[PDB]
A paper describes a structure:
However, in Xanthomonas campestris and some other bacteria, these reactions are catalyzed by a single bifunctional N-acetylglutamate synthase/kinase (NAGS/K), which has been proposed to have evolved from the fusion of ancestral NAGK and N-acetyltransferase. We have now succeeded in solving the structures of two NAGS/K enzymes, from Maricaulus maris ([name]/K) and X. campestris (xcNAGS/K) that have substantially higher sequence similarity to vertebrate NAGS. In both crystals and solution, ngNAGS is consistently hexameric, while [name]/K and xcNAGS/K, as determined herein, are tetrameric. Each [name]/K subunit has two domains, the AAK domain (residues 1–290) and the NAT domain (residues 292–441) connected by a hinge residue, Gly291.
As noted in Methods, crystals of [name]/K were obtained in trigonal space group [name], hexagonal space group P6222 and orthorhombic space group P212121. Cell parameters for the trigonal crystal form of [name]/K are a = b = 95.1, c = 253.0 Å and β = 120°, consistent with two subunits per asymmetric unit and 42% solvent content. Even though this crystal form diffracts to only 4.3 Å resolution, the structural solution in space group [name] could be found by molecular replacement using the A–X dimer of the P212121 crystal form as the search model. Packing analysis indicates that the 2-fold symmetry axis of the molecular tetramer is aligned with the 2-fold crystallographic axis perpendicular to the plane of the tetramer ring. The tetrameric structures of the other two crystal forms (space groups: P6222 and [name]) are similar.
Residue numbers in the entry:
A (entry chain A), D (entry chain A): 5 to 440
B (entry chain X), C (entry chain X): 5 to 439
């Protein structure tokens, strides 16, 4: 194994979008090599675009990553079994495939599966086709739904055989009960059980839609279940469809570490989505709630002082928290990220902003900032010249002001005359953390 | 992938027998994806010698060849883990595995199967494990034999997915009826159906035995079903066992092109057997019958002169064939191997013996010799000292005689005084090929 | 050899900064055998960090580049094994090694040298150790300094024998007078003579220090001898040490083509320094003086429009240059980097700033900025929000102002109220490049 | 290291001339990798045939072998220093190179050396040029011979650096005294000291002559110093030249294990010489004396019975050695190989022929056979049908006779009538070793 990595990495060291690939490699250097990625795909894409999914899969595996790919044959089977016939039966709320449809789906996927594995190989990747035997599942209903079952135990045995070898495990979605009765698993129950078993770092659904949509119909650049979910279920414009995947993605992530994430995208924007700070697709985390409030008394000072000591590096001076006045407060449920407003000549003033190393990487330091600006469109703050984080402040503000030691910033459509006054004030505020 | 294929020629280009690999392999340009090779193995070898088969399979695939390997779990299943949980195997005709044994064989082979695929990768080969879903088979008997079935249709779909990628398709021996009923195919019916479907160039069973035996117990260097089979079934020393595989191998080849062949061997002699003109193991063809004749006139001279020019390397001098007298003639149907007797002072005398490089390797040069000695127990012939073949002549004869240039031989329980005369004649006979 | 060269492109073809290696390397198609790179190192690094230099050298050579490395044994010889047998080094001008120290330095470097070549091979590189016989040198002083000499003629014969084979020629720092008298060249005179002989494109000293320092003690991101040198010698904070290497590096480059450049760095920042437009270490060129002017007329417009089309990517609108008013103009001699001031309400205003990709990497875009600020302590300019350069503008300014599309900047100790006016002007100024 | 071998060997397994290359590889698998081969070369070959030596060297190294090559510049310097001048001085009995010739030979060889290393690389091999620093040597005479010295200690340090890397160490023949005085070593003293230090298995001198000559002028297919040497020094036709190399080669081998050998040949016959059982060049061993005699009483029976028990596998029946009559006896000094003649109806009869496994491989079983036939041109013997050694008997005889169990052979221009009688006798002789 330590053979392909070294160079594939001495590569990744110098690039614009490199720092965030070599490290996946090191993390899953070994053993959790498949713990890299799960990836679902609706029947359509593989059919109408056999070639793009394929071009994609071969980049992850060559980089050291390991897609463990799963596919259904929505459209090729959905339509191919009507050519044949006896296609209708969807008993409870989803598809019943009675004894007659068994041989079709085998033969179809298996056809396609290879089509995909070979499509994968065509693209320069390495992969193993693993189209039977992954899902042990119990058939739970004999009469009604016909011949459909449920994932009870997972033989990861096979995937690892492909992966260990640097192959993308291309699991199709069929299964065998443990006595052998071949069964059709609708792929979602499959993906879960699977994501469960594997604990990948990322899980993606490839569709032709290739992004998800807001009220205005634009692509959705991230969700945060932790906060967003309830609302999100509960809006009309959110069409029937969009409430359920969200149900399911919350479980998928509710059952993985948070360190996990998710996109849903079209193959073409696949590149821009995993490794950049904008992108084109939906990434979904569970992320964490933010706690708000104007009520300095509802917050844990012992604990926040405990938050602060770790982010920056100093403890607040004595008698300080008592003295703080305070306008509005944002603490994410775990007291590892927080934002605080005092006031000044009417201007909302950012007093302290502290995000622990773990929180920034989860992309949380960043949700925080967001309720803070939704609430304060006109905002002033200051900052040490070296706080290497200054750069994010310049990217976001509509104002700046630098002296040797300190730099006062502002964010709002104000003209400097106005600003100069509170700003002058801002340079004058004293240091809140002790000495240099 | 970069370093592999290349660092295989400018490697085997600095040695003596490099032309025979390029020439059997290039001639083995039956890529046809996987139409390369089928390969049975008895349960035993994988167990007691996981490592050998494995070392072997990795040479074919890196060379450009493509073993499509298949395996049962004879001993590992026969014994341990079937005897462990004390289930026990029930035989009616051959083995009945009733509903109880299903989970064991899956779980056992599947174990071992990966054991082998990983054994394969351990050895530096590329392979895919294809341990379920190749054999669609019908369970034909419900009550009696329990849960056992029969190959009706073959999804080569899988093998080609491994092979196409340069993987040794390592199909283990289980199957699914088309409705799904998991079933135990006893491997033979599997291999046939399979070899049927595939039409490989070569098909080899691997066993501990690693060779097959004659009357005297020595390894058997080739058979020729075409001629040998009838007798071969019909000899007592030929033990019960040895009659049937021959029954089956006749079918396997009877159902493949003749261009096909077959070894049965232990991993260790696998090297010497495929690509050399001696070897160590059993190669089996169907070959062709030879018809026996004294009739110079019933033979194709234009064509034999065509056979001779290729074996040795000179053409017969003018007016020769017409001149040739001829006591008796053996040509294998294809005019690529032949043996000819003239006469001399009563002694049957080998005049010419030519077997083309292809025929030698098929083990046919060698059937030819056989009717020739069944017919002439007392025999004389001669030969050049360098004809590197000489060794075989000395292994066989019961006489020799060497002078710098030529060497007269004889094969018969005669005392030199008798012999000396025809022999002296033998040295005297002139060269039949030019300078 | 098969797997190496190839598994280097379809590898660095699936990443963002792959064009800059292909483009500095292909542009670095100064194979000229070894005319690739020279590389000094102080005794220390090889000792305390045998492994780093080593990890480094193996990247150049596998890439197609060819480090011709040279080494002294500063610390290993200075201390241990010279202090061990208690000989001790005698300095008159710099170091005298009288007859007694000969065997030590041979034996020491030669040790270490292999240590490095093997360190090199450990790292997956290819190299040849070339630890005697490169420096033919004359011992000029017999009595005083003891046994020390001077490089008169260079046998590159050896280096090319290692390099031609894809070996990092690892010349250690000993020499033989032409009659044979083994001699200790203090390495500098060696490196010069050597860089002289070789004409590499780049030449780098490796030290623990791994960067060079300014007044404030920060790493120095580039010098420009052409302009900087005089001042540079002539500053007190510039400590004794820092004046001389600069003396020597001026000569080294004064004697190479300008196309040459130079880092001085610690192994760890070696990556970021050669192939990026920021980096971490000292790059030194001779660069060229800039002459200072307010005379629009003394500048080559056809040629500047030629400079501008390349940096940004649009051409100026018609009748423009004629229109341009112009307070002051900085063009580096080569018309590949330039800065221009118009005016506005009294404020010097940066109108255009264009540095071609080549100039940036030479660290020249950056000298330019320098006379521009020495001249205009109070300065205003503007900029697109995306011009990925913006960051440098924010690192420098003492003012900013952002709106969706554009961003007005300023650099001076002014209070926003003053500024707001010219700034409001700044946002108002129209685009100078088309759409 | 275990990287290049495996395949380079799975290669060598099937060939006509293969069994005798893979094993050199295994022997010198590691560590004694340079203990593979030394190789000298006269100035001429590298000049007039830069390309052949070169084509040669690259086959050994690619096969796993490791030539450690040494060269002088006989002709290119011999002639190039007369262009210059002051070329004459050969003080004792060989060449004096006074202070003036130092810079020439450096500069010449070093030129050529690289020429050879590059010639080596041109040929597809891997090599390192190691043209200074191998020979530490003392200059022993200051005034007379000018500036020439003598090999006192050997830094093998360098060779191993090339070899370890799979390079053919191409040592040129210059040296440095330990204080540094550059000196010219005439290459022979160099080769010895070197062969000494290295203990290679084979050592070869490449010349344009490319073989050595007998009385009749034909190429000499092997010598055996052990026996041949005294005579060999002592024959007139043996010209002045041919007595001395033989002096030197005896020392070279007298100071290496016997397991060693030697050819002297032209590059073109280099292929046929190391790996076949004829060849074209001279191979030289020390080999071992053969002891002869008709005197059964001068031989060690306890010991021969000790020889016999190991070769075949049986001990002679009781009272046997006493009974043996005996015509002529050949024992090589070490009692590990022997040949014995009794008589029968006048015909010299080979009674026992036993060569221990070690002796056959030294090629000694084979010298033995040779005095035995020089002495008995008409010879009869017999042999078991399976004694796998039968084949050598057929290659050599001018007669045969096979029955199921035994086979009677003869060697001589006799007609079978004559022979049949002693032969009939031969089949009738009883087994000398006990039962099957």
């Amino acid at each position: 194994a330590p053979g392909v990595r070294q160079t594939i990495v001495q590569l990744l060291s110098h690039m614009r979008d490199g720092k965030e690939i070599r490290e996946y490699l090191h993390r899953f250097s070994g053993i959790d090599q498949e713990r890299f990625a799960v990836i679902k795909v609706g029947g359509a894409v593989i059919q109408d675009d056999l070639p793009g999914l394929a071009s994609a899969l071969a980049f992850l595996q060559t980089v050291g990553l390991t897609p463990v790919v799963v596919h259904g044959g929505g459209p090729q089977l959905d339509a191919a079994l009507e050519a044949a016939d006896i296609p209708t039966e969807r008993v409870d709320g989803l598809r019943v495939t009675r004894d007659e449809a068994i041989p079709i789906i085998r033969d179809t996927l298996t056809q396609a599966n290879l089509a995909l594995v070979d499509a994968i190989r065509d693209a320069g990747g390495r992969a193993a086709a693993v189209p039977r035997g992954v899902f042990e599942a119990d058939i739970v209903d004999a009469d009604k739904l016909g011949r459909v079952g449920e994932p009870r135990h997972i033989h990861l045995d096979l995937v690892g055989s492909a992966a260990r070898a640097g192959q993308a495990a291309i699991l199709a979605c069929l299964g065998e009960t443990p006595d052998g009765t071949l069964v059709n698993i609708n792929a979602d129950v499959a993906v879960r059980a699977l994501v469960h078993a594997l604990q990948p770092y990322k899980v993606v659904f490839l569709t032709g839609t290739g992004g998800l949509l807001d009220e205005d119909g634009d692509i959705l650049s991230s969700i945060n279940l932790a906060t967003d979910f309830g609302d999100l279920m509960q809006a009309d414009w959110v069409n029937g469809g969009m409430r359920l995947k969200l149900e399911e993605i919350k479980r998928l992530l509710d059952d993985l570490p948070l360190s996990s994430s998710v996109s849903i995208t079209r193959p073409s924007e696949l590149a821009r989505e995993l490794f950049t700070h904008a992108g084109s697709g939906t990434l979904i985390r569970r992320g964490e709630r933010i706690v708000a409030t104007d009520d300095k008394s509802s917050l844990d000072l012992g604990r926040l002082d405990n938050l602060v000591k770790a982010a920056f590096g100093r403890p607040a001076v004595e008698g300080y928290w008592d003295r703080l006045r305070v306008d509005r407060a944002f603490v994410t449920e775990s007291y590892r990220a927080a934002a605080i407003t005092t006031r000044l000549d009417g201007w909302v003033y950012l007093d302290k902003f502290a995000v622990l190393d773990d929180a920034r990487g989860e992309g949380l330091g960043r949700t925080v900032w967001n309720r803070l600006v939704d609430y304060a469109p006109q905002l002033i703050w200051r900052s040490r010249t070296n706080n290497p984080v200054n750069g994010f402040y310049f990217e976001e503000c509509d104002g700046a002001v630098r002296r040797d030691e300190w730099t006062v910033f502002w964010r709002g459509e104000m003209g400097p005359v106005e600003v100069a006054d509170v700003v002058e004030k801002a340079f004058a505020l004293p240091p809140t953390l002790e000495a240099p």
